[PDB]
Write a protein that binds this ligand. Structure first.
Ligand code: FMN
Lengths: 63, 49, 64, 192, 112, 188
């Protein structure tokens, strides 16, 4: 259950007026004996993914 | 820190129970009792009465 | 490596039977080297002993 | 009642049953409990092994004497259920045997009256002889638990449950028992 | 069932065991112990006759400690039915015009 | 009182440190009247005791029934695993849908008690300390088409048992159960 070492890292990009992206930051989280990755736990709640599944009201039997 | 350094952080409390006392009068040491009364009083009263 | 041993369970102690029979069945299904089970202090009923004989993968049952 | 080849050989060969005018009747193997209690690598404390080696014992003709009196250094005493147990006749067990013949064979309505009467006797004997002493003695003086101070209790729980030689609580559950008691003292005597 | 085996069993270990059972397994033990009790009372009845017949006038002190002994066992069985009774019952349970509040004499008490 | 007095009476004799005065005479020690008259020598190694009794039985049994002669004692490869209920050199067996499992494994094992006898009738084997079901009986459990061939059946050291099945129509070798070096059973 306990992690020896956690490491989250990657570019932070901003959408420009033109809709091209640019690097303006880096994620650099490092930890020793942790129970979690806080960076991803943050972005899940306070952010969103690019795509979102939305369920039909009623599942439709195809076959 | 899951619930390891956010769960062992919390102490144990003592809620008091009622220790009802009979309130017998506090008896002082003899040397402090002889201040209060005058020295002539020793052997002067008939305690039977 | 290869050795075995057994287990005595007092029949007149319903609590040790309640945790201990399941414990053998479990350890015997993981292949622990428990060759046999002696039930002391009593002899079980046919319907019980039948469950010890079939269900715990034992070589033999001791009865006193 | 086996210890050597010599006494256990007649049962291997079947010839034991000849003595009783039956035909030979041989056995497929033997078990040795009592025999093996003084072996190098059991946990029986050295003093207890000396105590076992001292028991002379008695042949099969006489063993039932044990229901009456120490026979080869050994008596029977009843369990809490009334099952016999064969125990070495230590002071402890002789006291157990006395209380089976006197207190525990009484009907329930005579039991409590008899304990009040024999109280000072029973406590002398628990403290002198038995493995479980009378809890409420401070400096060898037999009290009751209602005539003991909260300190006298704490100090006595440590005396009986904490081992000075090994510097540890004999069982963790005993440490939880004394710790729970100290937490009661705080609950009872705190104002706030 | 190892609870109810027509032989005296230590009550602390019975009470603990009885905790961990199903309600239909408890109901089975209870039926079995009740039957054991009836067998011991019909045994103590027969013993009551051979006493009353012989007390009409050795081998009477023997009829007496045969019924003393059955009461030791019988005390264990109804001590066991009492623990069952206790376990059963455990499973059931688990205007103001004085300016005391707002001071309206003061410009800021209203909501400045 | 009777419970408090008698409750938990049997550990104390093993742990005198936790008894008042470290005094045995306070304590319950369990022991038999009759058996007590052989318990004399303190701290005898358990092997010394149990061998004593066993080597005693042999010494005697030898005298009565083998005229004090070890040469008359039947020799077997390994002693054990016999439920208390019950010669050809180049054979060939043929499993059907009828062939009884118990009959089939008697045959492969053969008469002599050796590695082959163990291999097919040992119900269990040991991985490290654990007891797993015998994989060699799993493999040779009989079904339509499988054909066992034994060779040097009457000299264990070179015996080879060679299972063959249907493989893409024809019949090819699928197992080769034999000895390597002296004490190793290879199941190629
Ligand atoms: C210290 C001691 C403890 C025993 N504990 C048990 C036990 O827990 N369960 C049991 O069925 N028998 C127990 N027995 C009985 C033995 O299993 C066996 O019946 C007996 O020791 C053999 O008799 P012997 O002692 O005369 O050689 C015990 C015997 C002794 C001496």
């Amino acid at each position: 259950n306990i992690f020896s070492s956690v490491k989250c890292f990657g570019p932070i990009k901003v959408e420009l007026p033109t809709k091209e992206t640019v690097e303006i930051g880096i994620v650099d989280y490092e930890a020793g004996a942790s129970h979690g990755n806080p960076v991803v736990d943050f972005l899940k709640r306070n952010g969103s993914t690019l795509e979102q599944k939305v369920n039909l009201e009623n599942p439709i039997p195809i076959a | 820190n899951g619930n390891s350094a956010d769960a062992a952080y919390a102490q144990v409390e003592i809620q008091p129970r009622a220790n009802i006392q009979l309130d017998f009068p506090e008896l002082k040491p003899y040397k402090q009792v002889k201040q209060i009364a005058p020295a002539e009083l020793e052997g002067l009263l008939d305690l039977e009465r | 490596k290869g050795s075995t041993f057994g287990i005595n369970l007092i029949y007149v102690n319903p609590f040790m039977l309640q945790w201990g029979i399941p414990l053998i069945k479990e350890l015997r299904s993981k292949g622990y080297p428990i060759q046999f089970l002696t039930i002391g202090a009593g002899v079980p009923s046919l319907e019980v002993a039948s469950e010890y004989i079939e269900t715990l993968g034992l070589k033999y049952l001791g009865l006193k | 009642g086996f210890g050597s080849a010599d006494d256990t050989y007649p049962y291997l060969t079947g010839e034991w049953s000849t003595k009783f005018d039956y035909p030979p009747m041989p056995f497929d193997g033997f078990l040795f409990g009592s025999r093996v209690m003084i072996a190098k690598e059991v946990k029986t404390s050295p003093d207890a092994k000396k105590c076992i080696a001292a028991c002379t014992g008695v042949p099969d003709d006489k063993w039932e004497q044990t229901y009456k009196k120490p026979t080869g250094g050994i008596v029977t005493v009843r369990s809490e259920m009334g099952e016999p147990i064969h125990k070495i006749a230590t002071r402890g067990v002789m006291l157990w045997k006395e209380f089976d013949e006197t207190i525990f064979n009484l009907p329930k309505n005579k039991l409590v009256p008899t304990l009040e009467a024999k109280r000072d006797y029973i406590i002398s004997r628990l403290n002198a002889d038995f493995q479980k002493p009378w809890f409420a003695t401070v400096n060898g003086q037999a009290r009751d638990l209602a005539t003991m101070t909260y300190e006298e209790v704490a100090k006595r729980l440590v005396e009986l449950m904490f081992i000075r030689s090994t510097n540890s609580w004999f069982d963790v559950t005993w440490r939880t028992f004394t710790g729970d008691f100290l937490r009661r003292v705080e609950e009872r005597f705190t104002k706030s | 069932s190892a609870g109810g085996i027509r032989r005296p069993i230590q009550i602390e270990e019975f009470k603990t065991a009885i905790s961990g059972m199903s309600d239909m397994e408890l109901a089975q033990i209870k039926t079995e112990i009740e039957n054991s009790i009836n067998h011991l009372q019909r045994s103590n009845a027969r013993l009551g006759k051979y006493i009353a017949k012989l007390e009409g006038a050795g081998d009477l002190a023997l009829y007496k400690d045969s019924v003393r002994e059955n009461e030791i066992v019988l005390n264990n069985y109804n001590e066991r039915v009492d623990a069952l009774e206790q376990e059963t019952v455990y499973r059931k349970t688990g205007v103001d015009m004085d300016n005391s509040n707002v001071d309206v004499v003061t410009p800021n008490s209203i909501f400045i | 009182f009777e419970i408090f007095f008698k409750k938990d009476s049997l550990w104390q004799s093993e742990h005198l440190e936790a008894v008042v005065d470290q005094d045995v005479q306070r304590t319950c020690i369990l022991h038999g009247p009759v058996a007590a008259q052989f318990t004399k020598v303190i701290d005898e190694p358990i092997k010394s005791i149990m061998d004593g009794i066993h080597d005693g039985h042999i010494k005697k049994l030898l005298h009565q029934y083998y005229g004090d002669d070890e040469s008359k004692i039947p020799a077997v490869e390994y002693f054990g695993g016999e439920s208390p209920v019950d010669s050809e050199d180049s054979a060939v067996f043929k499993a059907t849908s009828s062939t009884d499992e118990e009959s089939w494994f008697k045959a492969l094992a053969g008469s002599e008690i050796n590695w082959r006898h163990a291999s097919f009738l040992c119900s269990f084997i040991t991985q490290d300390k654990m007891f797993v079901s015998n994989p060699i009986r799993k493999v040779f459990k009989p079904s339509q088409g499988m054909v066992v061939e034994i060779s040097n059946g009457n000299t264990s050291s070179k015996t080879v048992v060679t299972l063959s099945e249907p493989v893409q129509g024809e019949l090819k070798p699928t197992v080769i159960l034999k000895l390597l070096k002296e004490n190793i059973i290879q199941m190629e």
